[PDB]
Assembly symmetry: D2
Homo-oligomer: 116 residues x 4
């Protein structure tokens, strides 16, 4: 599992469960091609998005659907989504964890990158 | 001034100076149309992007060119850029400040929406 | 004004208004001596805490009374208060801004140190 | 394990390893009594600080020695340490994860609180 997403809720002090995540990859013609998607589990984690073989070098966008999360909880938030855009695997395969901490009018995202 | 951008540097403990910022508005065909842009000042701020007349309700994207900022400082960063995507609403308060606090592998953004 | 405190609310997307802030200086016996205090203004800021003459090198603690803030808004918070502990140094720039961004179960603090 | 500490480094995009952590508990006479201490592992985690029996109700302070972390890496940071102060177990036993994301002039801390 070379791409994992972890989401926390800063209002409840809990994992952010059932958060939809869509990953895109920049194609040769410079558009955002859909790459993988999923939703966070009861632990606020999303595993199984892709494989080492399919997660080739490229520029990736991880869109975390924060508005859809907050609205399903009946709250009106500020952002449409949190976007995390990065070049991956350009020095060989790595494992990436994208973490996000959510509030209704704010979020903070960090990457943990490890070398198998 | 209905839209301001403030950028801080969490490594140096300073404003983030001369950071390029591009603002886009979502068009009817879901493409991102250029709207306004500039570079942050010595105080890490970018004022004068738009006017109340032009800043109508809709979805906007503020792209902060963090990669160039870190590279100019000789530091290797993670993100291509920081992105802040939000709906402008006339119901709420009138002035939007988008603030971003930058680290090489992490950022933190909030909205301060006031009258 | 060598020391300013700025407090933001990440739930409401606003300055955090009327938040009590207490600043202490570490004494020779390692106790915390009261130094200055106030409440944030309508812009979430607290100015006028000290003077350049009084703000000598040393270790300071800025305590932000976040628990009372959240309770006044009818929200149940995690932390008793937010604490920012740092050394003032004459070598670096002259003006310290301690900023804090508050959520019920989380905060984010940075220092903006300028001339 | 009812009290766990997780620390990340926002400069390196990695766990913050070998970070010293000291936990204190407010005593009846209102001073900070030493309660437990340890240091983060290669995964940036600190387990085994206390037990369910010993982690009674009280006000706790988790001091994360960020200055000692940054200086051991040869960098001069702003804060002395990050302090996380909270009432614990006042509605019965809970499990607490205190997470912190570190930069030289900034940090962000969050709590994840779960009910066994
Ligand atoms: O830089 S200043 O001295 O102007 O002080 C300010 C003024 C201001 O509007 C905002 C801020 C800080 C915002 C901020 C944003 C995200 C975080 O995770 C933490 C803090 C600091
Ligand atoms: O507390 S947990 O059990 O969720 O453990 C984890 C695991 C993990 O990959 C990340 C985190 C915290 C990340 C985090 C991210 C951004 C912030 O501004 C503050 C904290 C916490």
């Amino acid at each position: 599992c070379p791409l994992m997403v972890k989401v926390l809720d800063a209002v409840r002090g809990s994992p952010a469960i059932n958060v939809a995540v869509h990953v895109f990859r920049k194609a040769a013609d410079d558009t955002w091609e859909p790459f993988a998607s999923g939703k966070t589990s009861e632990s606020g984690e999303l595993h199984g998005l892709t494989t080492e073989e399919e997660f080739v070098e490229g520029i990736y966008k991880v869109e975390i659907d924060t508005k859809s999360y907050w609205k399903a909880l009946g709250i009106s938030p500020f952002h449409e989504h949190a976007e995390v855009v990065f070049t991956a695997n350009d020095s060989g395969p790595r494992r990436y964890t994208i973490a996000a901490l959510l509030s209704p009018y704010s979020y903070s995202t960090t990457a943990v990158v490890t070398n198998p």
